[PDB]
Amino acid sequence: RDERRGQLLVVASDVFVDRGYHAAGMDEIADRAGVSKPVLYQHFSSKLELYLAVLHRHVENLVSGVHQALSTTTDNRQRLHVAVQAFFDFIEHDSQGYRLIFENDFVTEPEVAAQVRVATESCIDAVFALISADSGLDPHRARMIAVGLVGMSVDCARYWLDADKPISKSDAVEGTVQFAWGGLSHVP
Amino acid sequence: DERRGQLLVVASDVFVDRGYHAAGMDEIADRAGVSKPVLYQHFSSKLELYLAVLHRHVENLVSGVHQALSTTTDNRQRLHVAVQAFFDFIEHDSQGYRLIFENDFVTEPEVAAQVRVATESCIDAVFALISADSGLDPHRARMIAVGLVGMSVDCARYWLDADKPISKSDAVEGTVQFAWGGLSHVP
DNA sequence: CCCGTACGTAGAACTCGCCAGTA
DNA sequence: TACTGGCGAGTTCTACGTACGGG
């Protein structure tokens, strides 16, 4: 065989999203990869190691994109747009990462929760750092506002995706940006 | 009397401490100080017990939010009342916030459906208000309603996981001002 | 008449009797 | 005919859902 490890991680990411962590099985993974379960164990000595490798792959996909987006410009409207774009690009291309982060089913194993937390915190840090440097407010309050902003973006994105993309990505982004800028105050 | 109520409280405790999958009927019976057969006499399945706990918590949150939304037609005020109701929920019934938003049994759609309906009732109420008071068409109004509810829940989870570094009144006012004026009014 | 105990069983993460290609 | 190397056919352990001894 060739490097089956890469194809196994791709298949496992596909399978975990459909079944959930607990329901996914090594029998199902071997079945869909068309490889025997002992060979899979030859590559990954435990189910947890495979899970942490998938989680790490998805977090890095999102985080490098977010950092690169946040380094493009010092114009708050611009860094706002770049970050929201990075978020929508992630949720559209890596559907499995999206499901694994927002529909995580194995919180009972702290290494799992830590990978999720570090991924959520990278987003919070990028928004917070810009707001803190460019606002001078209370440190505690700025992080809370950054978290709210990130959460709002993810929830809008989840609405869009769960509705079978009823509007264009450009429309979803523009709506989110306009809402982030003028808030509820400019809706009526 | 009817031990059922105390059992639901104990089951909520066990699910929050251990998580759904790790929780066991043996542990719930142990902490309630009852035998496992009596627990099965009251709740025929772990899923049924979980759904009963979940339903209790959802009704707890949603009635508080809806009643908040009926107090006044000053949209800024109903924004504050609803967010306050949400923070109030997350502070008293600490176990419920975790059970709804840190849900570990995605494999059983009736669970996910009860969660979806709780989020959607709040979203529907906000959407209905935006549509009547803004002339916004459905897609944009619903997207904004979803954004507002998600933002409030995430702010509350940050605040609670950070051990409440500011007062709820402070937490509430900061959240409302950010929701109202957006980033344009942050510096 | 009824609670605490001790168990059957299901399901799945992990391993062992086959099976194909050489001199 | 024998040696390498990967696969169906067990093993066990864990935890849900019930059948013997006290009050």
Residue numbers in the entry:
A (entry chain A): 37 to 224
B (entry chain B): 38 to 224
Study authors write:
FasR is a TFR member that senses long and very long acyl-CoA moieties, subsequently turning off FAS I-mediated fatty acid biosynthesis. We have now determined the 3D structures of FasR from Mtb, in three different states obtained with the protein (i) crystallised alone, (ii) co-crystallised in complex with the fatty acid C20-acyl-CoA and (iii) in complex with a double-stranded DNA oligonucleotide bearing the specific FasR-binding sequence.
A number of crystals and cryo-protections methods were tested, consistently producing strongly anisotropic X-ray diffraction data, reaching 3.85 Å resolution in the best direction. A form of crystal disorder affected the position of the DNA double helix, occupying equivalent positions in different unit cells while sitting alternatively in both 5′→3′ directions according to a crystallographic twofold. However, the first ~30–35 amino acids at the N-termini are not visible in electron density, indicating they are not bound to the DNA, likely due to high flexibility. Such organization is associated to a pronounced bending of the DNA molecule. However, the structure did provide two accurate pieces of evidence: (i) the absence of ligand bound within the tunnel of the effector-binding domain, and (ii) a major conformational rearrangement bringing the HTH DNA-binding domains closer together in the dimer such that helices α3 now fit within two successive major grooves on the DNA molecule. That the FasR tunnel in the FasR–DNA complex is free of bound ligands is supported by unequivocal evidence from difference Fourier maps at both early and late stages of refinement (detailed in Methods).
